[PDB]
Design a protein around this ligand. Structure first.
Ligand code: BCL
Ligand code: BCL
Ligand code: BCL
Ligand code: BCL
Ligand SMILES: CC[C@H]1c2cc3[nH]c4c(c3C)C(=O)[C@H](C(=O)OC)c4c3nc(cc4[nH]c(cc(n2)[C@@H]1C)c(C(C)=O)c4C)[C@@H](C)[C@@H]3CCC(=O)OC/C=C(\C)CCC[C@@H](C)CCC[C@@H](C)CCCC(C)C
Ligand SMILES: CC[C@H]1c2cc3[nH]c4c(c3C)C(=O)[C@H](C(=O)OC)c4c3nc(cc4[nH]c(cc(n2)[C@@H]1C)c(C(C)=O)c4C)[C@@H](C)[C@@H]3CCC(=O)OC/C=C(\C)CCC[C@H](C)CCC[C@H](C)CCCC(C)C
Ligand SMILES: COC1=C(OC)C(=O)C(C/C=C(\C)CC/C=C(\C)CC/C=C(\C)CC/C=C(\C)CC/C=C(\C)CC/C=C(\C)CC/C=C(\C)CC/C=C(\C)CC/C=C(\C)CCC=C(C)C)=C(C)C1=O
Ligand code: HEM
Ligand SMILES: CCCCCCCCCCCC[N+](C)(C)[O-]
Ligand SMILES: CCCCCCCCCCCC[N+](C)(C)[O-]
Ligand SMILES: [Cl-]
Ligand SMILES: [Fe+2]
Lengths: 124, 267, 246, 281
């Protein structure tokens, strides 16, 4: 309840056009070797825009993490509904920009994915 | 009576008759333009300066997913959208009807009406059928320059990369073909225009050296060829087949298929 | 139990396309088929696609009908002989190709009548007989001389023939040295500020150009006769073409 | 194996090289000096691709992909199994294409027709060469071109696109597409008009080029004529492809940020960039 992982998994699929989940070993937990976006493995509890491999973070994403953002359910759900907006509010800057050209419409979808994220992408 | 219809029937814009529908078409058309327009200004804050700088950013979004398929949605949150659409609907269909009757009137084949019909299939699917089958107007395309481009992108991402949609590809194949084919026929015709080739209809009924050289150009180049007439039977299907296949692919999205990449890996 | 709607659709669609292809192709076999050998006799191996069922065109203005596919018209001696006994080789002209009308200088046995517009009047008329057509196109070609690819002059522009309907010049009536006059396909002549260049034909072949019985109207057959001759010059009037062409 | 009127046309001459040496036919097709050439390149590339099929380990035409020389390789060479092949193939292709085009030129000559055909075709080639030569050359690496794979080339498009956000925002890209759609429309309309004039209501004479212009006008409001409609299709089509090559030649060579940011210039004009309200304020 409050986040069905097996449901979030099917959802995350659509994320696979830009994201991928790979552990520190180099094994794929989910993805098609898409590098358009950052590796979501370990995104949970991670500071916004600090994934070592990803070299395409926006100014907003970097500045928003440096201000103290560490993806938790609350903020995660606000991000996937409208990145740019989210990054503007949380950043406090009205001219902030996000590079994630995608918007997850269903608020439920988010909560389901986050759960899936908790079940498969949490670096111990 | 008929007197009124006879009056309208002669409506014109110079040497062209607008017909009855033609009036309903244009009228309904402006109402559509008017609907979106007013809204944009409301969003611009009635300030002309702001209007002109954010003209491509304004968007008359459809109702929210919560409003399902009802027309209860308030004006500033879905109403105007429906109204606008209502006009674009009457606008378009009127025009289709006009194109038909005007062909009948000149006593010609109803090809143009049919061709145009294919383009309407795609339009029809995107903003009407699919939303109805999906259960809400929120699945509809918004009115706005940048906004609908944003739609498209998202729509694809959401449904697992349309690239992997057989119907998306099939469509694109025809979109390219259309360029190709017209690029050919166009150049070809010109290539033999010295033999009075642009005059196709007469070449249809009375073959000329032009309709031979062309037919022979390609037969020697690619092995086969068309006829002064038939080439156009290609041209037409080559084009109509874009929105056709096209339409189909969009309809199957969300309703039948959720993610095309996956559906692709199984087939 | 159920079925995958999408894949059934995609499947169906292909069945459809093939059928359309077949349809299209066969439909495009009304002109030119059956296929003959270099001999003049049926090839028997017409291909996978069969000829379509005949259809009749009711021509306007009372010109008659046309049923296709039908008996092959082509009625005029082909002044060309084989070059080898192996199929697939050219057929060189026996005499004068430019005159005998072959290769790039061929013409079709089209109806011997002028093309008529929507009302029933000729489509092409000599401007000096038009219903109010002035020369506002730019430069007046009427008067200036007319030379050949050999740079030698062969006559002057006497009148411009206009395509009343589409409203565009289509022919140039240039009087020759022997009083008579000829017609030139606009596309085959460049209009310069001081003269007219006919890079297609030689100053001597300006006579071989077929004539138009009526001095005020050219029939379709006559156009095919002309144009084909002119265009064919490019290939055959090359031995007499003066280099540095611009 | 000839049309009932092909004869009088199959005369000798028209070639550009070799003269009467290769001036003959193979059934319906004409050979010419460039016919053997096109076949040469064609076949060579066909082979090299199949070789890559073997090296890769599959004959499934839906997996066989020929990837170019890894970025690092720059503009130099590379092992046949590591980009080399893609390069040579890309050579046979360029060649086979340029040949296929010149061959057309010979046929245009023999028939005494125009040269518009190959002329146009050249555009497709420029477009091609733009993706596999010019762009990579300007960007400094072959790795920037696309793989030669049925599906693996779509992914290239996908990726390459999102490499700049929603590609849509590319001004040039917008125009091109615009041209592509219009061409389709234009082509549809064209055919439809002739077929409807050639195949009128049962029992009627064919229509006149005037019924044709009176109809087309009652739709657009203007009359472009026959020579005009065709000159417009060729125009519309060529443009699309042109604005496409332009569309890419600038992506990564002069523009690097997400195309959506490019439009800020319009918004940031002094006389309104700072006005409160609207969407961007
Ligand atoms: C800038 C545009 C992109 C691009 C974007 C897309 C997109 C987007 C799609 C395709 C799709 C296709 N692309 Mg592509 N494609 C590009 C460049 C190419 C080139 C090339 C040498 O440049 C080729 C041969 C192809 C070929 C193809 C076809 C396999 C396929 C559909 C046919 C079509 O649209 O025909 C238009 C032309 C005709 C209909 C005329 C007949 C041409 C025939 C059909 C082409 C035969 C191609 C053949 C299979 C490969 C030949 C290999 C040799 C035998 C060795 N693309 C460039 C890089 N392409 C579609 C698909 O299904 O992809 C999976 C698709 O959706
Ligand atoms: C990230 C985005 C996705 C993507 C998502 C989508 C989606 C989503 C769709 C397409 C569709 C299409 N895609 Mg795609 N597409 C992608 C990449 C590509 C690429 C490429 C090389 O990258 C190519 C070549 C294409 C090509 C195509 C076309 C074949 C097809 C649209 C046909 C069309 O234009 O109808 C144009 C004609 C109409 C829409 C007819 C309606 C017009 C009505 C009848 C008249 C209006 C009159 C009006 C009132 C007057 C107003 C005037 C104007 C204001 C000026 N796509 C990427 C991968 N694509 C569409 C499709 O399949 O459609 C079936 C579609 O829905
Ligand atoms: C699924 C495909 C997408 C889509 C994707 C794109 C893309 C991608 C582009 C356009 C562009 C345009 N679109 Mg759109 N467009 C869609 C549906 C529509 C509908 C509609 C059904 O009512 C209309 C009226 C338009 C109208 C327009 C024109 C303003 C513009 C040029 C097209 C053209 O050549 O028209 C010719 C017709 C008369 C002259 N689009 C659907 C939702 N459209 C181009 C542009 O510049 O957009 C900003 C562009 O690049
Ligand atoms: C997520 C992906 C991005 C995107 C990323 C890209 C990228 C990246 C590119 C394009 C390109 C194009 N995009 Mg886009 N594009 C997107 C969405 C769209 C949409 C839409 C509905 O939204 C549309 C309509 C388009 C449309 C287009 C076309 C205008 C353009 C293709 C050029 C072309 O057709 O060359 C057609 C002609 C050729 C490529 C010539 C090559 C053909 C050769 C000469 C002949 C082949 C002969 C053959 C081998 C022999 C066959 C065998 C025989 C049959 C036996 N894109 C989305 C937003 N797009 C491309 C572009 O600009 O290209 C210049 C490009 O690179
Ligand atoms: C304004 C440009 C438009 C255009 C025009 C155009 N195309 C043309 C012409 C013209 C004017 C011709 O005269 C010529 C023709 O003969 O008509 C059918 C042609 C043609 N356009 C073709 C295809 C084509 N055109 C396309 C596009 C376009 N053509 C544009 C829209 C497309 C696309 C990308 O949508 C394709 C696939 C050919 C069918 C034909 C030219 C035939 C030809 O060049 O043959 C040469 C040799 C071979 C058959 C062998 C090729 C084998 C290898 C050498 C290469 C292949 C390897 C690799 C490069 C390809 C791998 C593909 C992967 C991406 C999957
Ligand atoms: C195979 C499908 C292609 C196609 C075909 C097509 N379009 C057509 C037709 C045909 C056969 C017509 O007969 C009809 C026409 O009469 O055009 C001259 C039309 C038409 N295609 C149009 C637009 C259009 N077609 C498009 C696309 C396409 N049309 C496809 C490529 C596009 C896109 C999205 O690229 C657009 C924007 C209209 C201009 C015209 C139908 C007129 C119409 O619906 O009018 C209703 C509204 C008004 C009068 C309001 C105008 C608003 C104010 C300016 C006044
Ligand atoms: C008035 O004029 C004209 C003609 O004459 C009446 C013509 O035939 C044509 C030619 C066009 C056709 C016959 C229509 C069909 C062709 C296409 C839709 C174009 C796509 C092409 C192909 C699928 C075939 C490609 C094959 C090639 C290049 C040969 C390779 C060889 C294999 C052995 C045109 C353009 C024309 O305008
Ligand atoms: C699918 C619904 C989806 C999810 C979920 C998702 C999440 C996500 C997160 C949590 C981040 C931040 C990561 C971090 O700080 O380490 C993030 C960032 C980006 N995304 Fe994403 N994303 C989903 C889908 C997509 C899709 C479909 C795309 C490509 C169109 C995409 C892209 C990006 C990009 C780019 C970033 C980095 C953004 C920046 O630095 O501003 N995502 N995503
Ligand atoms: C005065 C503003 C004019 C804006 C016109 C906006 C056109 C955008 C059309 C895309 C939406 C299409 N539709 C029917 C599918 O919703
Ligand atoms: C009427 C013209 C004939 C056009 C034939 C074009 C066939 C192209 C097929 C592309 C293959 C598409 N896909 C994804 C479905 O496999
Ligand atoms: Cl019919
Ligand atoms: Fe035509």
């Amino acid at each position: 309840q409050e986040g069905d992982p097996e449901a979030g998994a099917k959802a995350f699929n659509q994320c696979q056009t830009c994201h991928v989940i790979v552990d520190d070993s180099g094994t794929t937990i989910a993805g098609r070797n898409a590098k358009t976006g950052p590796n979501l493995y370990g995104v949970v509890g991670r500071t916004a825009g600090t994934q070592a491999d990803f070299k395409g973070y926006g100014e907003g994403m970097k500045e928003a993490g440096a201000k103290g953002l560490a993806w938790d359910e609350e903020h995660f759900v606000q991000y996937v509904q409208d990145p740019t907006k989210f990054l503007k509010e949380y950043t406090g800057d009205a001219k902030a920009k996000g590079k994630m050209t995608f918007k997850l419409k269903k608020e439920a979808d988010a909560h389901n994915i986050w759960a899936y994220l908790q079940q498969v992408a949490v670096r111990p | 009576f008929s007197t009124l219809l006879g009056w309208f029937g002669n409506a014109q814009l110079g040497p062209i008759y607008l017909g009855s529908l033609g009036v309903l078409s244009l009228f309904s058309g402006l109402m559509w333009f008017f609907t979106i327009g007013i809204w944009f200004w409301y969003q611009a804050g009635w300030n002309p300066a702001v209007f002109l700088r954010d003209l491509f950013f304004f968007s008359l979004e459809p109702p929210a997913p919560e409003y399902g398929l009802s027309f209860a949605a308030p004006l500033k949150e879905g109403g105007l959208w429906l109204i606008a659409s209502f006009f674009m609907f009457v606008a378009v269909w009127s025009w289709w009807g006009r194109t038909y009757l005007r062909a009948q009137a000149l006593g010609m084949g109803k090809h143009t009406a049919w061709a145009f019909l294919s383009a309407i299939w795609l339009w029809m699917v995107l903003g009407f059928i699919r939303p109805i089958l999906m259960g809400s107007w929120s699945e509809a395309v918004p009115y706005g320059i940048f906004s609908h481009l944003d739609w498209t992108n998202n729509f694809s991402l959401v449904h697992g990369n349309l690239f992997y949609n057989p119907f998306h590809g099939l469509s694109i194949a025809f979109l390219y073909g259309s360029a190709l084919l017209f690029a050919m026929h166009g150049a070809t015709i010109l290539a033999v225009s010295r033999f009075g080739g642009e005059r196709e209809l007469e070449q249809i009924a009375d073959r000329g050296t032009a309709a031979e050289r062309a037919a022979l150009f390609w037969r020697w180049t690619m092995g086969f060829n068309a006829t002064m007439e038939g080439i156009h039977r290609w041209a037409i299907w080559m084009a109509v087949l874009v929105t056709l296949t096209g339409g189909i692919g969009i309809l199957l999205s969300g309703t039948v298929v959720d993610n095309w990449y996956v559906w692709g890996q199984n087939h | 139990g159920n079925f995958d709607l999408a894949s059934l659709a995609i499947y169906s669609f292909w069945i459809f396309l093939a059928g359309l292809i077949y349809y299209l192709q066969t439909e495009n076999m009304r002109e030119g088929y059956p296929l003959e050998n270099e001999d003049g006799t049926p090839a028997a191996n017409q291909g996978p696609f069969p000829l379509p069922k005949p259809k009749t065109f009711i021509l306007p203005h009372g010109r008659g009908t046309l049923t296709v596919p039908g008996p092959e018209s082509e009625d005029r001696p082909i002044a060309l002989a084989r070059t080898a006994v192996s199929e697939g080789f050219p057929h060189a002209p026996t005499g004068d190709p430019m005159k005998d009308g072959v290769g790039p200088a061929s013409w079709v046995a089209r109806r011997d009548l002028p093309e008529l517009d929507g009302h029933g009047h000729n489509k092409i008329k000599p401007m000096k007989a038009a219903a109010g057509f002035h020369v506002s196109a730019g430069k007046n070609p009427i008067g200036l001389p007319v030379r050949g690819c050999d740079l030698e002059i062969a006559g002057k522009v006497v009148d411009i023939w206009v395509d009343i309907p589409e409203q565009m010049a289509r022919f140039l009536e240039v009087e020759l040295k022997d009083g008579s006059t000829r017609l030139l396909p606009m596309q085959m002549v460049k209009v310069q500020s001081n003269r007219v260049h006919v890079n297609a034909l030689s100053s001597d072949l300006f006579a071989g150009i077929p004539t138009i019985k009526s001095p005020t109207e050219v029939t379709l057959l006559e156009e095919d006769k002309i144009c084909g001759y002119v265009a064919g010059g490019l290939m055959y009037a090359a031995p007499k073409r003066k280099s540095v062409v611009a | 194996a000839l049309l009932s009127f092909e004869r009088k046309y199959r005369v000798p001459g028209g070639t550009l090289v070799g003269g009467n040496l290769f001036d003959f036919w193979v059934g319906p097709f004409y050979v010419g000096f460039f016919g053997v050439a096109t076949f040469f390149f064609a076949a060579l590339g066909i082979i090299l691709i199949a070789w890559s099929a073997v090296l890769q380990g599959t004959w499934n035409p839906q997996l066989i992909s020929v990837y170019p020389p890894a970025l690092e390789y720059g503009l130099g060479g590379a092992p046949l199994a590591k980009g080399g092949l893609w390069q040579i193939i890309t050579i046979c292709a360029t060649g086979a294409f340029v040949s296929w085009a010149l061959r057309e030129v010979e046929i245009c000559r023999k028939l005494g027709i125009g040269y518009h055909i190959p002329f146009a075709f050249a555009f497709a080639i420029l477009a091609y060469l733009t993706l596999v030569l010019f762009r990579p050359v300007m960007m400094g690496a072959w790795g920037y071109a696309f793989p030669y794979g049925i599906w693996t080339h779509l992914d290239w498009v996908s990726n390459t696109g999102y490499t700049y956000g929603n590609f849509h925002y590319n001004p040039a890209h917008m125009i091109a597409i615009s041209f592509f759609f219009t061409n389709a429309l234009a082509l549809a309309l064209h055919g439809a008009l002739v077929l409807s004039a050639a195949n009128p209501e049962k029992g009627k004479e064919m229509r006149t080029p005037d019924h044709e212009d009176t109809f087309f006008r009652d739709l657009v409001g203007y009359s472009i004529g026959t020579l005009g409609i065709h000159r417009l299709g060729l125009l519309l089509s060529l443009s699309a492809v042109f604005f496409s090559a332009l569309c890419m030649i600038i992506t990564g060579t002069i523009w690097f940020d997400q195309w959506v940011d490019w439009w800020q210039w319009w918004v940031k004009l002094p006389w309104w960039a700072n006005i409160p309200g609207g969407i961007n304020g």
